[PDB]
Amino acid sequence: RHMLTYGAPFNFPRWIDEHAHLLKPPVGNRQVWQDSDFIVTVVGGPNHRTDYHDDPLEEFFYQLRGNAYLNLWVDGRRERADLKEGDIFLLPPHVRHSPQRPEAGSACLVIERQRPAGMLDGFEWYCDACGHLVHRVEVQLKSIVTDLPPLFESFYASEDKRRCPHCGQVHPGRAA
Amino acid sequence: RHMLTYGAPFNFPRWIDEHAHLLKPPVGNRQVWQDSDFIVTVVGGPNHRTDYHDDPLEEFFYQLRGNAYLNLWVDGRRERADLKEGDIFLLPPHVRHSPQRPEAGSACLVIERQRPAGMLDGFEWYCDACGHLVHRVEVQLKSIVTDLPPLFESFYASEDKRRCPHCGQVHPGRAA
Ligand SMILES: Nc1c(O)cccc1C(=O)O
């Protein structure tokens, strides 16, 4: 039996309202419950990003407020999947995805799983000129909010990491 | 890389509207995507039930439409956790819970995980007179919609299974 480790139910719209100032730059996402198997986050905007995420497990999306879209690699081709207000979406493992969240006040429920030891997440960048993989970092992810920054920053700070090994074009880095 | 196995995003309110006739007796719940790790269901009403679920993994709740409540066993005592319209809630593993969904047209998003082989779900009934455990079935759950019925029915059909081993009171069975 036992204890309601994660607290009682609570009103989600009110919660999103009250954390609105973190669903903006420079924070943008916010985890609901700590130390749980289900990683439950609300992601706001605006945030554009240049990395593609390779998640070894599924990701559930429910775009509660406003609109966003996912840049994908599907079947070897760049595709866009729109997250219009009201949309839900389940992403299979390892589909590369780059969330674009251009609207302020937007809010997306994203649910993922804690990765077991040895199951790594990948973060990738691709050449705008030729489309080859430019750089990949693999990470044992412990914090969907926190392990990402230093990894993006070390890509941004390194012309070496950003240099396409197929055509030599140096990826632009922080912004597309 | 690869394929959007689960299809493209789609409008969730419209989906719930169109499956409304299954979010009623005798169906009541409806799984969104098949053969996925995340088991994503919408549960409507009315449905009252007498069993407590012992889930070996977490359960996420988002009560989108209308109100419901969870009869719980918390710290050895009967407790009620209300799922008011708008509430989200994360249930820890093995907290015994009996969802009560009295409103027609209600709709709750419930997300769970596929149980790995050997990780069993329990379904339990407790004596209204003395509170002792009356009957427990453990099951390797493959279908959150479908493995439950025959299990509830075999409890309902058996005075033996329904007989409290502490005080001899025969549990009422189908309805409280
Ligand atoms: N999909 C995301 C992820 O895995 C981590 C952080 C944010 C997102 C997102 O949808 O923006």
Ligand SMILES: Nc1c(O)cccc1C(=O)O
């Ligand atoms: N929590 C539930 C479960 O695990 C299975 C089916 C339905 C529910 C519910 O919330 O009603």
Ligand SMILES: [Fe+2]
């Ligand atoms: Fe290139």
Ligand SMILES: [Fe+2]
């Ligand atoms: Fe009893």
Ligand SMILES: [Fe+3]
């Ligand atoms: Fe991701």
Ligand SMILES: [Fe+3]
């Ligand atoms: Fe349950």
Ligand SMILES: [O]
């Ligand atoms: O992501």
Ligand SMILES: [O]
């Ligand atoms: O449940």
